[PDB]
Design a protein around this ligand. Structure first.
Ligand SMILES: Cc1cc2nc3c(=O)[nH]c(=O)nc-3n(C[C@H](O)[C@H](O)[C@H](O)COP(=O)(O)O)c2cc1C
Length: 169
């Protein structure tokens, strides 16, 4: 497909979100779903449009599967690629490390020459600190199933609608 979605997940929440995003875009013919646990860094090279999903774990850390491939990311040339990010987190329980994984990955991938698209407003959340915030916006979609599951469906619909414009759909 045109868009490659790569996600990592520990308790399955990020996978469910990935599946909803693929569905909102139009299905398998538009978005390829890939579990980063089963991929090689070079698989990211096959796409010009990428969506990266990762939940934050263990107080500000990357989900372990993303942690595993992190050092290999240097071998991929992201210049010219448009990359969007999404993450699952818990704003109440980890108010000072909310969605940090998403920010760690964005800082790394953009330093390799990619363009970040998909900024999201921070006003619909209550947290103290997040490494995924730059100039008062999140660098990608923040989902919180632990505290705001009622908002997930419309957050995804709205985000995907905005991304379509960025990805030329
Ligand atoms: C042990 C543990 C640590 C967590 N640490 C963080 C954290 O530092 N920041 C955050 O935003 N959420 C944190 N969370 C919340 C998870 O990211 C959240 O539950 C998410 O839905 C997990 O998605 P997964 O099922 O895709 O792995 C933590 C949850 C647990 C159980």
């Amino acid at each position: 497909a045109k868009i490659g979605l790569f996600y990592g997940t520990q308790t399955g929440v990020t996978q469910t979100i990935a599946e909803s995003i693929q569905q909102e875009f139009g299905g398998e013919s538009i978005v390829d779903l890939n579990d980063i646990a089963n991929a090689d860094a070079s698989d990211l090279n096959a796409y010009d449009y990428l969506i990266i999903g990762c939940p934050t774990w263990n107080v500000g850390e990357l989900q372990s599967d993303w942690e595993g491939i992190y050092d290999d990311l240097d071998s991929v040339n992201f210049q010219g690629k448009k990359v969007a990010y999404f993450g699952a987190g818990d704003q109440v329980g980890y108010s000072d490390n909310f969605q940090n994984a998403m920010g760690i990955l964005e800082e790394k991938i953009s330093s390799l020459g990619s363009q970040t698209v998909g900024y999201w407003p921070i006003e619909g959340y209550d947290f103290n600190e997040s490494k995924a915030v730059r100039n008062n916006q999140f660098v990608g979609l923040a989902i919180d199933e632990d505290n705001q599951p009622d908002l997930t469906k419309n957050r995804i619909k709205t985000w995907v609608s905005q991304l379509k414009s960025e990805f030329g759909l």
